[PDB]
Amino acid sequence: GSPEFMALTQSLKLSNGVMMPVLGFGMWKLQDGNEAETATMWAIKSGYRHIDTAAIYKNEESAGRAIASCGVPREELFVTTKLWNSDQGYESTLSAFEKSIKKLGLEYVDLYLIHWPGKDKFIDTWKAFEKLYADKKVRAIGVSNFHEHHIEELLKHCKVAPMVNQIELHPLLNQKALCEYCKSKNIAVTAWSPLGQGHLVEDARLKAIGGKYGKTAAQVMLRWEIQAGVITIPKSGNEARIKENGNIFDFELTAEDIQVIDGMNAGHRYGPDPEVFMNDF
Template sequence: MKSIQDYAILHNGVKMPWLGLGVYKVKNGDEVINAVKTALEAGYRHVDTAAFYDNEEGVGQAIKESGVPREQIFITTKVWNSDQGYETTLKAFETSLKKIGLDYIDLYLVHWPVKGKYKETYKALEKLYKDGLVRAIGVSNFHIHHLEDLMAECEIKPMVNQVEYHPRLTQKELHAFCKQHHIQLEAWAPLMRGGLSDEPTLLEIGKKYGKSPAQIILRWDLQHEVVTIPKSVTPHRIKENADIFDFELTAEEMEKIDALNMNKRIGPDPDNFDF
């Protein structure tokens, strides 16, 4: 990965940029519009939102105002838990599409594996995909057993699994399973919401390259072939997060960062969430 224009190729041939902007907890209106426009000006071509984030309108507005051609931007959104089920998912998608103000979405995800519902939800995603309203479909927060359960019945294998992933939670078995099945792993909360900014290992490696711990983590993600979507609303941070293509971590440094794993989550466990 030599530049911000580099992309992963999903199993259906769709190109997904390795680096994107996440907009979880970014306020709709000026805050999200400015963040997305700053990211697009800095060369990002991938924005990750969700119905639950309540800022799809702002994301759509920013895309329109940016002047960047629509086909150059990769947009992800997700169906929320209370909308899961076949018909309700189709309706939720229609709402998201209207809010964003686009003709199609690049990637639509099942936000969480809601028990007894996610398979019906995913069937709706398959329909949207066949109808050409989405270019790729996938899941978020799925463990191996959720994926196996889904893949035993689905027609179209998920193209992406977006999960909590950072040096304290490396999810090695899940990553290996996804690789084996050509499902692209994507990291949310890659920077552990700032929880690793004073981690000595990252500071030490960062010193060598003149990079921040955040930049070291994001580079580590990319070298593990994990798509990553750091969130920020601060212009200089948005730009800094993209400044990770002028150096490469050694195999030894990658292993040192891998060794920080503690199987520690900052978000809910997908087997035990309550919302």
């Protein structure tokens, strides 16, 4: 059968030529140990080749075991981790990265992101990212929760421009403007809480649309995101839902459905606002 021929490899090309799978597995709060480890294994076995974690999630080690246990070579897997706010700063970042890489038990990370912008320590933190990139400890470097002015500020103080901006994005917060800005700068967008953190999986508007294709609201959201040119990383600790989220390279939303979903925007965040969130800074 070959796990190879079945893998969910549809990807987009980042500005530096690296291919990043448009569908990834979110790991926020999977409980370190058996839970996170088993869920991650179900994902990898289902065809996922992109995994999203973060130091702050306290489950990098579980992710590592899954990766070391699945039957797929490291080269075919895209692994992302993030630098938590408390570790910003040049030397602090290099040290944080080592801790993360050692828990993941890997020789290199595919993508490393600054978790939150904060106030005035990301530019310095970035030099460390560019250092890790130059040395090849990470194959791509990016940002997370950055508004357009945060990026403009970084672009004035960097040698290498970020390649990804991971932001909260779903039907109630489509982020069309920030997505456009990022595209202008050749920055790929990854959507977090792409299913509205589970609060949109039963939306009548989304379900109705899904009914036209024998697809669920969750699958409709993920497809809407992918067609919008964004990368999506839904999470789940349920084996059947993991497989469900991966069955989105089957159909296509019509121009009408897309306009209907884009029409749902309410500027609603389920998460914190990058402008004010200062935890651990």
